[PDB]
Amino acid sequence: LREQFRVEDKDGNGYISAAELRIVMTNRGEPLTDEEVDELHRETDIDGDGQVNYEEFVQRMRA
Numbered sequence: 001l002r003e004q005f006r007v008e009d010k011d012g013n014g015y016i017s018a019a020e021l022r023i024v025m026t027n028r029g030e031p032l033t034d035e036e037v038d039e040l041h042r043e044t045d046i047d048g049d050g051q052v053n054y055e056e057f058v059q060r061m062r063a
């Protein structure tokens with residue numbers, strides 16, 4: 001979890017941004033358009049501030 005968050009947190013600012021997540025999904029070859037990743041990010045973003053923080057990320061991985 002910790003290690004995975006750091007991978008996706010490209011700029012190391014303690015958040016996964018939507019753009020960072022789009023880079024992650026593109027690097028993994030996930031069958032999702034950019035728009036669908038934006039929706040995935042938005043759903044993961046519990047507090048709605050535009051960033052996926054570590055707590056929201058762990059709650060994601062619990063799915």
Ligand SMILES: O=[N+]([O-])c1ccc2[nH]nnc2c1
Pocket residue numbers: 008016021040041042044045052057060
């Ligand atoms: O932040 N995310 O919305 C999110 C969602 C699914 C993921 N799978 N692997 N990393 C992920 C990140």
Ligand SMILES: [Ca+2]
Pocket residue numbers: 008009010011012013014015016017020
């Ligand atoms: Ca970041």
Ligand SMILES: [Ca+2]
Pocket residue numbers: 042043044045046047048
């Ligand atoms: Ca949200």
Ligand SMILES: [Ca+2]
Pocket residue numbers: 047053
């Ligand atoms: Ca919060």
Ligand SMILES: [Ca+2]
Pocket residue numbers: 045046047048049050051052053056
């Ligand atoms: Ca958030």
